[PDB]
Amino acid sequence: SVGSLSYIFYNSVGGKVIRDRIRASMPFPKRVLVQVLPFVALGTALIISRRGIEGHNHGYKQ
Amino acid sequence: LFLLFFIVNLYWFNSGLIFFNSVYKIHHDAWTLIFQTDSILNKLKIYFFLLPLYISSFIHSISTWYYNYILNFLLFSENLNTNTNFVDYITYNTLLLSKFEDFNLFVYIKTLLITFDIRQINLDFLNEYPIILLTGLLFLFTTIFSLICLSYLGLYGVFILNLASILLFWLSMLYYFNLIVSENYYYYISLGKWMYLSNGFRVSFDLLIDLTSISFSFLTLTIGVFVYIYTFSYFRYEPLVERLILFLNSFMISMILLVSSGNFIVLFLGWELIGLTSFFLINFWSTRVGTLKAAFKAFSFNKLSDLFLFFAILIIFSTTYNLDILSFNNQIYLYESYNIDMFYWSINLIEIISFFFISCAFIKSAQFGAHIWLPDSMEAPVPASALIHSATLVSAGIYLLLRLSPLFELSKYAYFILPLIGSVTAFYGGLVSAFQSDTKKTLAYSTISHCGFLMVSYSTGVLEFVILYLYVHGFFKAATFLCVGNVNRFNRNIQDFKRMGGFYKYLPFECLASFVCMINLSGLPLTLGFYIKHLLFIGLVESYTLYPLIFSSLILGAIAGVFYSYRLFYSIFFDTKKGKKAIYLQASRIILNSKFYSNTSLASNLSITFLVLISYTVILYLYCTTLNNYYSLSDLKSIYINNAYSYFYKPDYNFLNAVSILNWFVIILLISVIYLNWRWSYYYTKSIDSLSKFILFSFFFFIFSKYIL
Amino acid sequence: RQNFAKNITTTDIPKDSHHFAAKRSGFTQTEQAPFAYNDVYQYPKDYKPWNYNYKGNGVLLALFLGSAFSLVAYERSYASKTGRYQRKVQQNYYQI
Amino acid sequence: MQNAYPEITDQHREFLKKQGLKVYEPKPLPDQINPFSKTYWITNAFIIGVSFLARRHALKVGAPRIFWSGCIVGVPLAAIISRGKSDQLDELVGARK
Amino acid sequence: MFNLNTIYLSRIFIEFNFYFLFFLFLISSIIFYFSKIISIQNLNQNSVFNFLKLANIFGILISFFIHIISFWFYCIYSYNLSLNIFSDINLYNSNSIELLNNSLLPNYFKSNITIDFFGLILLTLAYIVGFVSILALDTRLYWKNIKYIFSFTIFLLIVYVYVTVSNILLFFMCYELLLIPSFLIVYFVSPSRRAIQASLYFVIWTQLGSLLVLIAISYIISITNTYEFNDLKYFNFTNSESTIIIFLIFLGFGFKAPIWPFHYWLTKTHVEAPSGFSIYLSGFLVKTALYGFYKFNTSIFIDIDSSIFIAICIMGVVDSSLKMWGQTDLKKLVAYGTIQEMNIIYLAFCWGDSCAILGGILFSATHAFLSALMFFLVDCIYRRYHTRSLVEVNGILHITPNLGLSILFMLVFFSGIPGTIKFISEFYIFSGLLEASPFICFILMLVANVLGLIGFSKSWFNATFGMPKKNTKYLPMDLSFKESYIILYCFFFLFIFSYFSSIFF
Amino acid sequence: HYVPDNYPDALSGFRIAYRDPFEVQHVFAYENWEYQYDGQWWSMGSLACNVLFFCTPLFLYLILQVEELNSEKRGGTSNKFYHNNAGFFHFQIYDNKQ
Amino acid sequence: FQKYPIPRYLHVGQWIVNKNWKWNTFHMFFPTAILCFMVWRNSMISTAKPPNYGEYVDPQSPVAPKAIKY
Amino acid sequence: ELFLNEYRKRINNEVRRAAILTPTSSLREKMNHKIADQILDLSSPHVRGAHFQAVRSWTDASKIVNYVEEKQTKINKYGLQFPLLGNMTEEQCASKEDEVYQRLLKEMQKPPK
Amino acid sequence: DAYYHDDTHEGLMNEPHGYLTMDDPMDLRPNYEKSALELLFLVSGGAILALMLG
Amino acid sequence: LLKFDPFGFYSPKLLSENRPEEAMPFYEDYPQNDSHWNLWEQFPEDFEDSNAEREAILKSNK
Amino acid sequence: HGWDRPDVPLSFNPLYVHKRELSIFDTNMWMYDQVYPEYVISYNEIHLVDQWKGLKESFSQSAYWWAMMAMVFGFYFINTTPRQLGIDTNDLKGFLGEYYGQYKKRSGIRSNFLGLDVTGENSIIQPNYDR
Numbered sequence A: 001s002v003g004s005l006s007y008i009f010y011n012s013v014g015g016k017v018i019r020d021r022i023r024a025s026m027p028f029p030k031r032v033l034v035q036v037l038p039f040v041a042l043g044t045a046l047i048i049s050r051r052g053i054e055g056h057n058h059g060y061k062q
Numbered sequence B: 001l002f003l004l005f006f007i008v009n010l011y012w013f014n015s016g017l018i019f020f021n022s023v024y025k026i027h028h029d030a031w032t033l034i035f036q037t038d039s040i041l042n043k044l045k046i047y048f049f050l051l052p053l054y055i056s057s058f059i060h061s062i063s064t065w066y067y068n069y070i071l072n073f074l075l076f077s078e079n080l081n082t083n084t085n086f087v088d089y090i091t092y093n094t095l096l097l098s099k100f101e102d103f104n105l106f107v108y109i110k111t112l113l114i115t116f117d118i119r120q121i122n123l124d125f126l127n128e129y130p131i132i133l134l135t136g137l138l139f140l141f142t143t144i145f146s147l148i149c150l151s152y153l154g155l156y157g158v159f160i161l162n163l164a165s166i167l168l169f170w171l172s173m174l175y176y177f178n179l180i181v182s183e184n185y186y187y188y189i190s191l192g193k194w195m196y197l198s199n200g201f202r203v204s205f206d207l208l209i210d211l212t213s214i215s216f217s218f219l220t221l222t223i224g225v226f227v228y229i230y231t232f233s234y235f236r237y238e239p240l241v242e243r244l245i246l247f248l249n250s251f252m253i254s255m256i257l258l259v260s261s262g263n264f265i266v267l268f269l270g271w272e273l274i275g276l277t278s279f280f281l282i283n284f285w286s287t288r289v290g291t292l293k294a295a296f297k298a299f300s301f302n303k304l305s306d307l308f309l310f311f312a313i314l315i316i317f318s319t320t321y322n323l324d325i326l327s328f329n330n331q332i333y334l335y336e337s338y339n340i341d342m343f344y345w346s347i348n349l350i351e352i353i354s355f356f357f358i359s360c361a362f363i364k365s366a367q368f369g370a371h372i373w374l375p376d377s378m379e380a381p382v383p384a385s386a387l388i389h390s391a392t393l394v395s396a397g398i399y400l401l402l403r404l405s406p407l408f409e410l411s412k413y414a415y416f417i418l419p420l421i422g423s424v425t426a427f428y429g430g431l432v433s434a435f436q437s438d439t440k441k442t443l444a445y446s447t448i449s450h451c452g453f454l455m456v457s458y459s460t461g462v463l464e465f466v467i468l469y470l471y472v473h474g475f476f477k478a479a480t481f482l483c484v485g486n487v488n489r490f491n492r493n494i495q496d497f498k499r500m501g502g503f504y505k506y507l508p509f510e511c512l513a514s515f516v517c518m519i520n521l522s523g524l525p526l527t528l529g530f531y532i533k534h535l536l537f538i539g540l541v542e543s544y545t546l547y548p549l550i551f552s553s554l555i556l557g558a559i560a561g562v563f564y565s566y567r568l569f570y571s572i573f574f575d576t577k578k579g580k581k582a583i584y585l586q587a588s589r590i591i592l593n594s595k596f597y598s599n600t601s602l603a604s605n606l607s608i609t610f611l612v613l614i615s616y617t618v619i620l621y622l623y624c625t626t627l628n629n630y631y632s633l634s635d636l637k638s639i640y641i642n643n644a645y646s647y648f649y650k651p652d653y654n655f656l657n658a659v660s661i662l663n664w665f666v667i668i669l670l671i672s673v674i675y676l677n678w679r680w681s682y683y684y685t686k687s688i689d690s691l692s693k694f695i696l697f698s699f700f701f702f703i704f705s706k707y708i709l
Numbered sequence C: 001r002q003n004f005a006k007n008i009t010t011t012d013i014p015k016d017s018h019h020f021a022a023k024r025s026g027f028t029q030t031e032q033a034p035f036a037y038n039d040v041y042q043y044p045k046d047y048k049p050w051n052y053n054y055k056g057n058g059v060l061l062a063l064f065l066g067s068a069f070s071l072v073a074y075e076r077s078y079a080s081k082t083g084r085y086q087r088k089v090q091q092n093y094y095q096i
Numbered sequence D: 001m002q003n004a005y006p007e008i009t010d011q012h013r014e015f016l017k018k019q020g021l022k023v024y025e026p027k028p029l030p031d032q033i034n035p036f037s038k039t040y041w042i043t044n045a046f047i048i049g050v051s052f053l054a055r056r057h058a059l060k061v062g063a064p065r066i067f068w069s070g071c072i073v074g075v076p077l078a079a080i081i082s083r084g085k086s087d088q089l090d091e092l093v094g095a096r097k
Numbered sequence E: 001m002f003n004l005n006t007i008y009l010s011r012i013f014i015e016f017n018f019y020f021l022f023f024l025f026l027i028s029s030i031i032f033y034f035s036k037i038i039s040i041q042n043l044n045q046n047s048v049f050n051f052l053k054l055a056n057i058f059g060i061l062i063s064f065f066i067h068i069i070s071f072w073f074y075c076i077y078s079y080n081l082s083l084n085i086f087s088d089i090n091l092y093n094s095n096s097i098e099l100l101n102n103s104l105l106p107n108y109f110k111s112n113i114t115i116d117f118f119g120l121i122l123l124t125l126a127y128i129v130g131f132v133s134i135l136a137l138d139t140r141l142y143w144k145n146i147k148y149i150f151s152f153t154i155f156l157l158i159v160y161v162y163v164t165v166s167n168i169l170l171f172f173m174c175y176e177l178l179l180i181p182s183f184l185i186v187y188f189v190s191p192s193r194r195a196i197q198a199s200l201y202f203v204i205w206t207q208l209g210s211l212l213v214l215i216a217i218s219y220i221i222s223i224t225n226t227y228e229f230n231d232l233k234y235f236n237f238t239n240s241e242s243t244i245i246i247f248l249i250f251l252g253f254g255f256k257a258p259i260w261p262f263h264y265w266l267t268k269t270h271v272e273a274p275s276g277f278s279i280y281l282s283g284f285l286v287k288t289a290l291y292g293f294y295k296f297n298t299s300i301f302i303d304i305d306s307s308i309f310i311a312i313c314i315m316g317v318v319d320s321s322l323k324m325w326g327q328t329d330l331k332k333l334v335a336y337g338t339i340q341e342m343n344i345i346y347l348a349f350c351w352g353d354s355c356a357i358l359g360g361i362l363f364s365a366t367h368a369f370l371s372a373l374m375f376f377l378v379d380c381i382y383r384r385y386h387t388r389s390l391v392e393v394n395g396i397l398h399i400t401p402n403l404g405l406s407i408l409f410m411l412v413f414f415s416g417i418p419g420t421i422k423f424i425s426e427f428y429i430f431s432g433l434l435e436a437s438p439f440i441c442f443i444l445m446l447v448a449n450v451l452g453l454i455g456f457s458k459s460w461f462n463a464t465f466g467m468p469k470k471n472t473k474y475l476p477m478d479l480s481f482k483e484s485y486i487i488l489y490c491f492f493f494l495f496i497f498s499y500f501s502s503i504f505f
Numbered sequence F: 001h002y003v004p005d006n007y008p009d010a011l012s013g014f015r016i017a018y019r020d021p022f023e024v025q026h027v028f029a030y031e032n033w034e035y036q037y038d039g040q041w042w043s044m045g046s047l048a049c050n051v052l053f054f055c056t057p058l059f060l061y062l063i064l065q066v067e068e069l070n071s072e073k074r075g076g077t078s079n080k081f082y083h084n085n086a087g088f089f090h091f092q093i094y095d096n097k098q
Numbered sequence G: 001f002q003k004y005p006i007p008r009y010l011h012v013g014q015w016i017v018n019k020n021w022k023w024n025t026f027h028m029f030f031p032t033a034i035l036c037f038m039v040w041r042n043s044m045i046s047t048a049k050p051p052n053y054g055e056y057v058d059p060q061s062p063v064a065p066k067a068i069k070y
Numbered sequence H: 001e002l003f004l005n006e007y008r009k010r011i012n013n014e015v016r017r018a019a020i021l022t023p024t025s026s027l028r029e030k031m032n033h034k035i036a037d038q039i040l041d042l043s044s045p046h047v048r049g050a051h052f053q054a055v056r057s058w059t060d061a062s063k064i065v066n067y068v069e070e071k072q073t074k075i076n077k078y079g080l081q082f083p084l085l086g087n088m089t090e091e092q093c094a095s096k097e098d099e100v101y102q103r104l105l106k107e108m109q110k111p112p113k
Numbered sequence I: 001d002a003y004y005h006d007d008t009h010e011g012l013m014n015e016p017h018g019y020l021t022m023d024d025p026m027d028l029r030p031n032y033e034k035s036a037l038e039l040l041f042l043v044s045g046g047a048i049l050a051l052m053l054g
Numbered sequence J: 001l002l003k004f005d006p007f008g009f010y011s012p013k014l015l016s017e018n019r020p021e022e023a024m025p026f027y028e029d030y031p032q033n034d035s036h037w038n039l040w041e042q043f044p045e046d047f048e049d050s051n052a053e054r055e056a057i058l059k060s061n062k
Numbered sequence K: 001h002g003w004d005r006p007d008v009p010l011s012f013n014p015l016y017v018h019k020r021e022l023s024i025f026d027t028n029m030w031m032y033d034q035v036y037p038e039y040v041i042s043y044n045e046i047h048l049v050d051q052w053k054g055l056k057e058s059f060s061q062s063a064y065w066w067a068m069m070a071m072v073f074g075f076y077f078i079n080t081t082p083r084q085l086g087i088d089t090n091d092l093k094g095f096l097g098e099y100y101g102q103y104k105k106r107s108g109i110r111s112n113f114l115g116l117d118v119t120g121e122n123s124i125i126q127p128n129y130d131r
């Protein structure tokens, strides 16, 4: 949900030129947060799902 | 500064690694000299001489744990490193000098440099792995991207990309095709699983590279390279010439993929792609709804063929549940004694499948009742028609029949169907071409006649003759189609020869090329066409119930090509000025006289010359491999070999007299077309005198050369 | 119809104020009133209307990171399913 | 599973060996072809670096870079696919498991 | 390596998706009702309509992603459970895994969750179709008509409840509830004036099918006073009872399939209904009816001959395919093709509990995707050219290149091309038919794949090409990036859906 | 005819022109066409073709019965509800509750 | 045919010529070549070729096709 | 039923491999040795294949399931289920491995036949 | 050809033109349809890669 | 169609997007893309929305 | 050259004013197009009136070509002897021998490998040893 909300709130500023100008006139930490956060949450959720869906934790391993 | 420091550090690290490997090799100083017993001087020497080695270890202690942490983050496993505390693990890993044991920085750098060297390519690796897969993938991807990126690259860019991809594909196929034909190479390449077909059945996207596939792909690729070289000439000021070229590239790629089928799903995919490519290519002028009718008719015929093929494949799968074409050919003899209860009838297992395959081929390879779409397909551009008519759409049926050769061997329905249908289709095509004034229509009817002759050859049971006829007919038809397209371009998109004439003076190159192509294609004596006709006539079997009609149709279709070729050549090049005064006079202005004067494009003319030379060389190589005393052909995978090769090796005087009768009919037709005064002329009496003098001189030469001297 | 706010405040609309000029003198006795607003929208100089202007690397980087994570997970799963802590490297590899 | 083929004799095998024939046996794939090869890994790394450089150059020139991005993304994906093909226990025409 | 975590994870994921959907629906209802007295769409910049629409779209997307993850987990759990039942060899030990209920949320209708792969496929397809329909419903909802915005979420919740229950009464009740939302959407959102009689006819046909199904279900329930499929299997029905039950279930499901000659309602609906509703009505309702028929049919053993149902399906397919050449309305032609596909799909499950369900599911998914693509194309054409008949709109590719290319690709996909999942489903279905009836299979392949296909193409090709000289000053513009992305997503689903694991196929 | 209070679809600038009367008549022709006399539906067009089309379901049933008989002759798959799964649904999770 | 004006707003490919076609072609050729090399390696990973000339398949080797043992 | 289909697929794969392994000059006799007999045994009457329903008798299904059970007993007698065909915990897997080691020692410690 | 005007002199040899889509590059409204569609596509791709690729 | 320009890329497009008629309302021009799925009116983060003029007037009158 | 030819006139795609009602009785029977709509099918041989008349005329005209074919066949049959063609005589165990061996094998009439009591005859595509 956080990733979907962030991506929607970061890339739906308007037209292509409007989005380009707005993202350009943004702070470097602000741009990083807009970029990193939406992808980071989805990636972490996918990683957690993949870890749960497997059985790599079995102790009968050599 | 930075460079000097890096050089010094690298030299120091190399020396330290050399010393460590030289001291740790004997397994005596690997821990003693490394881990000296305190002795602060020894500690300083160890951490000052191995410092370049030690620091990297500390660097190795940095990235590893972090990477391990990444693993702990990315796998939720390994329990991180809770056993350590990041101060003992770092110290242990940094102080462990066994990591840089028997490691040479210079060796690693030199090996990495040798990892990009091409001098060690060798030829056996190419033999082990055909690089033609890479070339085909590159060509397909280039075509797809050009369709997707038609804007970033202009007309010149699209042409350059497509030409580069196609030329790479053509160059790749040369040596590999030569090896396949001569060194007897075969291959099956599986591109992973493709699609789940039945419960637990996952068919894989596999391709079979065999002799037939190699030959068809080589012929199609050469024809496509020649067209793409010449297609830019015809569509000079065309609004979508890059689009036309891209469609042609897509069609060529589809034809090549269909020819390289490895499984029954691959063959169906190739047939569907060929049908879609033909439907789109015929729709060159989408703004014109008149050609849309022909496009719809062609699409309907292709869909009917695809439905028949799907039904046959479904029957085969229900019989065997195996989609591998090679395995099916190796297992087609198993279930010959079986029947399927369809409605109230019980037909043999082989009979129904063979009938379906033959019908599907007849729909694709134009036969009686299914050849209508072939003549109406002339609405496509000149290069499009050259590609469609010569091969691919026309060569689909022959290739499909040859691929399933063992299946077609034991079919009674095929046995009776193939000869009569082939002969009738060839005769009809020849007679139609003999009466067509349109260059496109004449060429299409000649192509239909050639397809009928090829089907008759397939009925003969000898594969080599079929392959030779396919190659020669395709090359010659492509050349003739290019010449006719050039003539039509000079005639302002006018294809009918009734409004043409005097173009030889306008286009000398086109006239000469058309003369050569008509001499080769029309089955004229003393050429590849004559050899193919003799081979086809040699292998006929006399057990056919309809033998008289079959023989009559074969003779009639064989004799009709020369008349049409001569008529087209004379009308276009050496007839009266039946063309409009605008076509000639506009280019007859004195101002245009310069060093660059030409009625056609130099690029098109050079492409035609190169294609003709390459085709002649390839046909000579094929005749050398097949028609010579030593059979250099690889295994045809056929267990039914006829004794018809005995006549080709050593026939009797009866076949000699039959061939003499055929050649005498040909000579009589040539004499009739040479001296028939269809119109009154100032030399009509002079023509009669010339003909009489020719007859008398021929009689005298026949008397003197065989008896007198 | 549209009921959104055209005069946005998140950024400044690039406008070219020299394209259109409003008449301000010498108007005829029956002449029409000049246009009050004459600002024209100004697009970026290097923006191509024929091609996508997205020149960022975030999407490609995310795709590469996902592919790398998938490869690492595949390696880990191959190790675990084989009962080995890490992947065992075979001495020779032959085609199937 | 059985051998499925008509059996032969070692004496005949030796007699054929005296004639210069060979028995075709599987050979290891070259390092360029092996997905578990340092050569493959170095090639992937060099391809990734060149793809980044070409992406920068295209950004400077405006040429298409989606193809470079796709190739770079598939650089690990191709290795994954090759390793999956290698690790499978099923056989089609290759050496027996 | 199969631990109890996977089963617990899958059950908790299903329960959490249902509860999250319920909570989002409750929040949206509270916001919509309690932010206005009349609850009408505010024709102002500050309006709850935008917030409600965004909430619905985002909730649908999040639930779709969560459902994809949960369906992967559920497939893994089902494979592990099937193996575990097959794993045990010694007679001393038996599969005994007793799990506890979660604390955060209670069981829906106080019923335990039962999972089937077909249910997950139907849920995913319904989610995608409803997302597409909602995205295409922007130009329909307006002042005083914004109340229908959350209907798609209600349908999704009903489907989730139905596909997770084991009670025949609950299944029948959920199957019957969808009619009211469909009637409400048709009566209030369709723009056509003739759509009133079309909605009435559709409601009447759906109610007739529901009445037949309800009679069959009541007979089944009264015969055995129990509400479990296991208990139903623990009982045997008489010959007449089984025949009547099978006939009634087939009649209801075929009226809801639709089947010949009960396809007038479907034809009129697809002719007159709004584009989003028709996309959702064709995509989802037919699949739900087929799933219900398959679930009921497997639970009941029948010794009767399926010749009647097979012949009905074949005749319906033939009738639907034959009428394609006479259809000049794009929506009508798409409806005829969808009817043919539905009849073909319903033909598959006529062999009882045999190995024919996988082909039916694959064909249902392929038909849903193709019908979604065709409806989206028809909606785009009606938005651009303001028409649905071919006589007034021609030469689309000349003025709309992307639309023409998309139409050509859709035609290629609808041709059952080898790479598409339609090819695999067609192969499976035709193999089964030829195993049962070869000549009938060949005839069915001859008609639909050629005759109906030729008619659909000629109708589509004539509009695809040409020269739109008419209405120069009012020519339409190219497709928006939203429509392009929707078409790309549909094509990607149709293609990549063939690469799914064969454990379920 | 537009529905009451129909919100205009203003896509592409709401630029629509007057339609051709003949085109409109053709568009709204099939939905309004009906027979003039009772029973005239039979002889309309081609009598034999209409008879075959109306009798197609009976012919299809007869063909299916013949095919079923042929399958029974060879013991193939029949048009019967093969309840071989005893009611257990395909991949239906079968777990007990604590 | 003589070239005629086309709508600049229309996304048409009718006789479209790009001045920077060289760089675009180079960029679309190089990464495509790299992808083609990767795909060729992937395809050659699993390949079947006929046995070499002069090499005969001894039937006792597992490379020879096997039979299902009942 | 899936295993019978798999056996038929294995026979087809063997035919396909012999196609590339043996030339057409000697493929006929090689296939006539044993392969064609097993191909005919693994036909539509014996394998579900493309048939939607594998119409077999009750005793026939009993025998097929019995053969499958015998094959399963043979496979699990060596502990081959983990992890392909059996989900076993750490302790159970270790105990089964120890029992398998003991059984293998006992079996290999027998006189030849 | 006889008189073939090069692109320098050709008034009708067009360069790249035409809008990619109907969307306005200078749009000020906070529309999120394209962004939502891209997010859905990326989510599907990531879910395929993360837990289903291998 | 030659003079058509929806986004105003090839020709200047006035901010008013129309020349108001002397007897017709100056209503907003219909956008080419009529997507009504537009998010809430987004103001820049940390925007001062207090009534400055009203506060000044309140200080004056107090 | 020599004349500043204007742009291509819009008359090159004239707009068709439908003067006749496109009755639903001819649905899809005419390919509709905003410029030059056409009939669905083309009959360029309109000199032939009807299909029966066209077939009669074609069969009347084809008699001459049939007679020419008969004359060619007669000229060949009255001037040639039967040839000696057939399958390779030195190989009797190939395409010929395999057929007799399979007809003598009849492996499709054997019992099931697992004792299922179902033979090849128990199939829609059933083996038949006496075709």
Ligand SMILES: Nc1ncnc2c1ncn2[C@@H]1O[C@H](COP(=O)(O)OP(=O)(O)O)[C@@H](O)[C@H]1O
Pocket: K017, K018, K019, K020, K021, K022, K023
């Ligand atoms: N809608 C229609 N109904 C009947 N006939 C038609 C229709 N459209 C075209 N035709 C036929 O096509 C031919 C072409 O007509 P057209 O050229 O438009 O008329 P005109 O020759 O007066 O210009 C006519 O002879 C007419 O018979």
